[PDB]
Design a protein around this nucleic acid. Structure first.
Lengths: 108, 125, 78, 95, 149, 206, 60
RNA sequence: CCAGCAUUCAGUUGGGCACUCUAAGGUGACUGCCGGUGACAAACCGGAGGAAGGUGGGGAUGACGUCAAAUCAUCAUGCCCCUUAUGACCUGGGCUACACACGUGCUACAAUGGACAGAACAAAGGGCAGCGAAACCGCGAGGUUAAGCCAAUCCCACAAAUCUGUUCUCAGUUCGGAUCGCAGUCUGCAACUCGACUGCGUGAAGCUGGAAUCGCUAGUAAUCGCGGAUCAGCAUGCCGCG
């Protein structure tokens, strides 16, 4: 697959492409705005000239590994420079600014 | 040419009966144009159906305020009182079928300390 | 903030321009946790007040975009 | 010509109602009726206890009702009469 | 105290009955008439079609395989857990049939309740059905506990 | 939680206001300038036994009606005492203050001054026994269809504080046609701080 | 801290955000009303002596 | 407010006090009256008329006292205690910590749903350094300038659920929306601890919850939005409204 990980062949055009890491719903709409494929066809049933225009737009964006690097780069950045928000990423506690006596069960 | 007013659940209806054929026009809109759910379409027609007044009077409607079932609910009182003006004979037939009450079930006010005007919030022990 | 520039206090901009003009020198007890970090601050060590002491911290080429309040542990835990 | 009365008490206002109307009628000013208007009112809610008892409230409501006066003709004899009007200050006449 | 009855609204646009509107008052999740009415009139159109009959004669004949004869009330003496046979009023035959309709209808599991309710009625018209045994097991509770009155 | 103060339960329906004007742009700062008036006039004229004050904001005029039951302590010469009043208040307000004084007939029927006389006798070291029953017979012989007095607190004793009735006649707190004067007044004693609740039923309206 | 807390509100603070509310009769924060500049308890006992010209009991 | 009367993109221009509505004064319901009941009394049962029938629905109103129930931290406060400090002022921190239990609240675990589009419908409250239209620009939160409004005139404010199409097809998914990254906007001296809200991404836990418990007699149960106090700023909070 273009992302290196598949889309299911029977879903619609927008939502199958949202399984691509880094690509959500509104990122899919900007691509298909440039593609112009009406967004409701079987993605088992396309042409490659149609899908070659799908490829190079994905080639233009931070999609597969690059978006996996740079946030993990930022995690490795801010922890190793102190930077208290680094410690909240570090210990297993919330980051964005919350209390602590309450639930916070996404991180312990 | 008979006239009436209609009030039910905080909304105002003005009903006047010109001699026509049964067409009901709601502030230059129609019934299905303005009110879906044909349950209420036979319900707004209920004062028209008991007395033999089927295809003989067109209705001008001034719906003001409120929501749809309260709006249409105001008309099904206002149709009656406007058609009370025609003949007071069948008033006794209508009054035994209700339809003249102006239902006093206004939405009650929220108490302080209670959520939904009768609901106590919760309880512990 | 968005477009007013990164916020500094007048005393912070004063002594660091006295620091940058000649030579890097002793640490500075700031009471301005609130202030940002400018790219001129790199290599300047300063003392941030934590609530009960001024903790000395370092500024490098990576600790640039944030404020000074990222380096003030005010709530110690175990 | 637009004159608006807005007060707190229905006893004072209705007593002060014809004080403008009938006296301006004496010089023939063609004054409209004392038209009422909806009451801009307000609700204050305050805990009845000193310290505890958030769920036991003590509501207080402030009502300011108002009635309207319009005059068609100028009639400058009434302008001297409207200037010399002497009322209890709860009504706060404004022209 | 004493007996206190409540009110009800007569008509029906289609299938001009009284008890059908009581079923419209059933499955009214959170105050939605027409959202349940959209479920209802689409169902009976299939019921008129999928079985080539008038849906009224399908409806109450299915109800007769649901409408019970005996309730069971109780009696606690120590820990004996006694039961009481109860004659079901002609009020309660109308009411408790609707509960045993709609609860098991939405619990079966298909695409929409347009399809859940429609095949449930045929499972009570042709009375081989899951909700029909709910009537039957109460008789099995009534047949054992008959001895008391 | 005990009985609601029956003045404010009757204010507006039967009993008129005291503060009377209309709110424009300054309705907070009308009150502060007027609450300083009532604290000033109760300061200097507590000895003069001034009961109640009504205030009119009268378009750069301040009209104060005064209820006392004697002018002879309050006007003095007639010109002497009232000029010291208006000179102080015009300095306190910053604008004109017009002063009029109304005498109260039957001084043993006004709740602000009937309760005040008890607190004078308590600070003069008189026990409650002779206190309340003398006060009630003043009110009953003056004409009153019901009088309820109550002094609550330490009785000059050591610790065990308690409320104490003495009342006669009809006190209809829940007939909404009342005309009931109600006021309280504190008392500074040697063994603490006595409170006095006194309210008088005068007769309802038909 | 009472009379300084009356005084600090009646001074000029370092910034206009550091204005707060205080009722000037029983001076405490936590609900001084903006319209009256009066406190939560001090609204009530002053209402029951014929004062605060508008407010009566509430029932509708 | 708009029926009749034309003019109108439009109650707009006229014009009008009908109707609606506004708010002052009456009026009406009292077991008054009919029948039956018991005693014939009170009162009960039924019927009539009537907008309304048995204290019409609701509010406000809470007897004597109970618990030495609550508040010296609203105030007042006797007594005790403090005083170059237990008083006053400033910065900054903290009241927001978190291995873990508990109440109390919302958003959900979906097909009565999700997504998009169309159509239509409220009540009450608020606005002077206060609301800010329209307009333009930003994907947007908004920015820009700015009419009008001290207000039934102008603005907040285009209500949501609803209805009708389209698409979705039963799975941890087109449900979920936390958690978290980056990019932003506002207010304010200043948003790091410690604000709200968008924009992009990320997409867990959970697929009706054990013993046990809680609310509710008719516009209530649940459900959906909106207004306001409080405030520079901030609500799943509480009032209040349909």
């Amino acid at each position: 697959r273009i992302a290196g990980v598949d889309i299911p062949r029977d879903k619609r055009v927008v939502i199958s492409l949202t399984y691509i890491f880094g690509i959500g719903r509104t990122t899919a709409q900007q691509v298909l705005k440039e593609a112009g494929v009406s967004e409701d066809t079987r993605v088992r049933d396309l042409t490659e000239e149609e899908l070659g225009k799908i490829r190079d737009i994905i080639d233009k964006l931070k999609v597969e590994g690059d978006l996996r690097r740079e946030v993990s780069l930022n995690i490795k950045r801010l922890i190793e420079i102190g930077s208290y928000r680094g410690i909240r990423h570090r210990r297993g506690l919330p980051v964005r600014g919350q209390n602590s006596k309450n639930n916070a069960r996404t991180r312990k | 040419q008979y006239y009436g007013t209609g009030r039910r659940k905080s909304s105002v209806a003005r009903v006047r009966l010109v001699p026509g054929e049964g067409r009901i026009v709601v502030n230059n809109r129609e019934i299905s144009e303005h009110i879906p759910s044909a349950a209420l379409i036979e319900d707004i027609k209920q004062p028209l159906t008991l007395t033999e007044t089927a295809g003989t009077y067109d209705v001008l409607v001034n719906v003001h305020g409120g929501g749809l079932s309260g709006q249409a609910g105001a008309i099904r009182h206002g149709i009656a009182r406007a058609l009370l003006e025609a003949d007071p004979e069948y008033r006794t037939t209508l009054k035994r079928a209700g339809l003249l009450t102006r239902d006093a079930r206004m939405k009650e006010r929220k108490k302080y300390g209670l959520k939904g005007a009768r609901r106590a919030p919760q309880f512990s022990k | 903030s968005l477009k007013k520039g990164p916020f500094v206090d007048g005393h912070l901009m004063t002594k660091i321009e006295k620091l940058n003009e000649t030579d890097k020198k002793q640490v500075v007890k700031t009471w301005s946790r609130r202030s940002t970090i400018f790219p001129q601050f790199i290599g300047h060590t300063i003392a941030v007040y934590d609530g009960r002491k001024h903790v000395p911290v370092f500024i490098s080429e990576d600790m640039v975009g944030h404020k000074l309040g990222e380096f003030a542990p005010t709530r110690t835990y175990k | 010509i637009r004159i608006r009365l807005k007060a707190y008490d229905h006893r004072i206002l209705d007593q002060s109602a014809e004080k403008i109307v009938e006296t301006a009628k004496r010089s023939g000013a063609s004054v409209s009726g004392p038209i009422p208007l909806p009451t801009e009112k307000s609700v204050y809610t305050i805990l009845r206890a000193v310290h505890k008892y958030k769920d036991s409230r003590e509501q207080f409501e402030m009502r300011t009702h108002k009635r309207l006066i319009d005059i068609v003709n100028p009639t400058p004899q009434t302008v001297d009469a409207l200037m010399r009007l002497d009322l209890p200050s709860g009504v706060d006449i404004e022209i | 105290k004493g007996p206190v009855a409540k009110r009800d609204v007569l008509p029906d646009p289609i299938y001009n009955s009284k008890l059908v509107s009581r079923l419209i008052n059933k499955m009214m999740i959170d105050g939605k008439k027409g959202k349940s009415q959209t479920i209802l009139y689409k169902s009976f159109d299939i019921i008129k079609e999928r079985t080539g009959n008038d849906a009224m004669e399908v409806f109450e004949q299915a109800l007769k395989n649901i409408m019970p004869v005996l309730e069971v009330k109780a009696r606690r003496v120590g820990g004996a857990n006694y039961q009481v046979p109860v004659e079901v009023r002609p009020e309660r035959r109308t009411t408790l049939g609707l509960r045993w309709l709609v609860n098991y209808a939405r619990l079966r599991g298909e695409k929409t309740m347009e399809e859940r309710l429609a095949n449930e009625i045929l499972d009570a018209a042709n009375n081989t059905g899951a909700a029909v045994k709910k009537r039957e097991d109460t008789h099995k509770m009534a047949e054992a506990n008959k001895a008391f009155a | 939680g005990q009985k609601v103060n029956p003045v404010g339960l009757r204010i507006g329906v039967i009993r008129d206001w005291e503060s009377k004007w209309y709110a424009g742009k300054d309705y907070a700062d009308f009150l502060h300038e007027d609450l300083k008036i009532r604290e000033y006039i109760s300061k200097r004229l507590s000895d003069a036994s001034v009961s109640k004050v009504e205030i009119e904001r009268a378009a750069n005029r301040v009209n104060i009606t005064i209820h006392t039951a004697k002018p002879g302590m309050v006007i003095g010469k007639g010109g002497s005492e009232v000029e010291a009043l208006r000179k102080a208040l015009n300095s306190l307000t910053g604008k004109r203050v017009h002063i009029n004084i109304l005498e109260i007939k039957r001084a043993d029927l006004d709740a602000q001054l009937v309760a005040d006389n008890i607190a004078r006798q308590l600070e003069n070291r008189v026990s409650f026994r002779r206190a309340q029953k003398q006060q009630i017979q003043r009110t009953m012989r003056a004409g009153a269809q019901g009088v309820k007095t109550m002094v609550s607190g330490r009785l000059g004793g050591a610790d065990i504080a308690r409320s104490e009735y003495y009342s006669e006649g009809t006190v209809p707190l829940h007939t909404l046609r009342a005309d009931i004067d109600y006021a309280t007044s504190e008392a500074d004693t040697t063994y603490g701080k006595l409170g006095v609740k006194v309210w008088i039923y005068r007769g309802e309206v038909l | 801290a009472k009379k300084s807390m009356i005084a600090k509100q009646q001074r000029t603070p370092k910034f206009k955000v550091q204005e707060y509310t205080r009722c000037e009769r029983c001076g405490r924060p936590h609900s001084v009303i903006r319209k009256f500049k009066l406190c939560r308890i001090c609204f009530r006992e002053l209402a029951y002596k014929g004062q605060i010209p508008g407010v009566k009991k509430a029932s509708w």
